[PDB]
């Protein structure tokens, strides 16, 4: 019952990394979901947080239950993750956007630790192989687009119905660019990524089929 090791699925690793690379300005966050067995916390899913805070944990604990019955496995909020650009629970810190001025080399750090009462120590992490990208993981990183859009729609709501015409034109101009900015940077590349993933899979699939066919002979 004592935490000894953390095992992170590769497809969940991809989601967290993708979320961290969404912006180099602010620290993004989310909640690690999975099972705790023989001293091993296995993360098989993740929840993207809108930005310590509460209540969201209740929505996460409920989602964890929805993940239990669907995946037929014990699922609970094991902890959280957060990004770090230009510089009782399980914590993951994805240090991103760090490049050399002359070397042109980019670095990405991933630190794993156990946190309780503001205290923490290092915890052994292993990224565990997955034969694919989970249905939940695909949906999770598509939600990133939806959440970002939702954040913007909320900001424009508070400034809606502005009496001054010049301000209304300005606000609609800001909302338009911001939505486009989300689509071009987040939504569109994800669309292309999925499309290319499918096409390039079938390219390898047909390649292996030709290999499989002649290997027997």
């Amino acid at each position: 019952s004592s935490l000894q090791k953390v095992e992170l699925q590769t497809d969940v690793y991809m989601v967290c990394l993708q979320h961290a690379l969404s912006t180099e300005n602010f620290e993004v966050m989310g909640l690690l979901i999975g099972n705790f067995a023989c001293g091993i916390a296995k993360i098989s899913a993740v929840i993207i947080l809108r930005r310590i805070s509460s209540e969201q944990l209740l929505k996460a604990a409920a989602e964890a239950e929805r993940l239990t019955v669907e995946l037929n496995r014990p699922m609970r909020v094991l902890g959280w993750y957060q990004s770090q650009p230009h510089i009782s629970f399980v914590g993951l810190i994805f240090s991103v956007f760090s490049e050399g001025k002359e070397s042109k080399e980019h670095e990405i750090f991933l630190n794993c630790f156990q946190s309780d009462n503001g205290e923490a120590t290092e915890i052994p992490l292993e990224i565990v192989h997955t034969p694919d990208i989970s249905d939940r993981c695909l949906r999770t990183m598509t939600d990133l687009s939806k959440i970002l859009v939702q954040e913007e729609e909320d900001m424009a709501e508070a400034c809606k119905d502005h009496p001054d015409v010049l301000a209304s034109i300005h606000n609609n101009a800001v909302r338009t660019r911001a939505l486009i900015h989300i689509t071009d940077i987040i939504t569109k590349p994800l669309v292309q990524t999925f499309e290319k993933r499918i096409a390039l899979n079938k390219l390898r699939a047909t390649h292996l089929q030709r290999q499989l066919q002649e290997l027997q002979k």
């Binding site: 508070a158 015409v165 010049l166 034109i169 800001v174």
Partner: protein, 240 residues
């Protein structure tokens, strides 16, 4: 929290009118007050200024003739949110006892009409000194209000320019309260356009250009009108 805002156009007109006058000069600040929710923020915008000889407002006494003050400002009393005082040949930005007295009187008289509290009635102290060889001209100014604790504290002034204005998210939040009860000259122009994004912004700017170009002779007319009336009054005074 309080912030005074003013455009380059309005501020230039203020300094333009000050360097014109023969000696010291005073007048009134015209504008509105906006409230923003965050606590509540107060933006006091300075729209325009108007000069006035203090002697025309005095009995005979150093007390402001409330009767004479109403006759000068007239229907523009609901816009007066402050007054200014300009002094040549001084780098000293100082509140005189006489200035304090004028502030209190002007605050009490206008607070009921302008739709603003007596708390944030403005006082603008401007000056203009020159160097020994008059090769360097220095212009200083500051905005003040009378505190509830009996203090004349300086208020931050923000000159709205193309780099940074007082509405800086990139959205423009809707103000919860406005003390303005006077029709805006520019918003009346947009209403005349009878509009029903980018295309709308183009027309407004173009219409503003034609409007701005038509105002130019009207400005010159009203200028020479007062200029002659300023001479006739002055000529009569010297005559006697």
């Amino acid at each position: 929290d309080l912030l005074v805002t003013i455009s380059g156009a309005a501020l230039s007109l203020l300094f333009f009118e000050n360097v014109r006058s023969v000696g010291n000069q005073m007048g009134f600040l015209l504008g509105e007050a906006l409230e923003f929710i965050v606590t509540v923020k107060i933006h006091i915008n300075v729209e325009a200024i108007v000069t006035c000889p203090l002697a025309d407002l005095l009995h005979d006494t150093n007390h402001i003739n409330k009767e004479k003050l109403k006759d000068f400002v007239r229907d523009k009393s609901k816009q007066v949110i402050g007054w200014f005082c300009f002094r040549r040949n001084t780098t000293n930005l100082t509140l005189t006892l006489k200035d304090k007295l004028l502030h209190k009187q002007f605050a009490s008289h206008f607070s009921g009409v302008n739709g603003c509290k007596e708390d944030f009635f403005l006082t603008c102290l401007l000056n203009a000194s020159t160097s020994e060889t008059s090769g360097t001209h220095k212009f200083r100014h500051v905005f003040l209000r009378h505190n509830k604790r009996g203090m004349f504290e300086p208020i931050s002034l923000k000159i709205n320019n193309l780099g940074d204005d007082a509405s800086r998210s990139d959205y423009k939040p809707t103000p919860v309260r406005k003390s303005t009860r006077t029709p805006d000259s520019f918003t009346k122009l947009i209403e005349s356009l009878n509009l029903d994004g980018l295309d709308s912004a183009m027309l407004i700017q173009k219409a503003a250009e034609h409007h701005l170009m038509s105002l130019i002779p009207k400005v010159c007319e009203s200028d020479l009108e007062v200029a002659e009336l300023e001479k006739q009054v002055h000529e009569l005074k010297i005559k006697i």
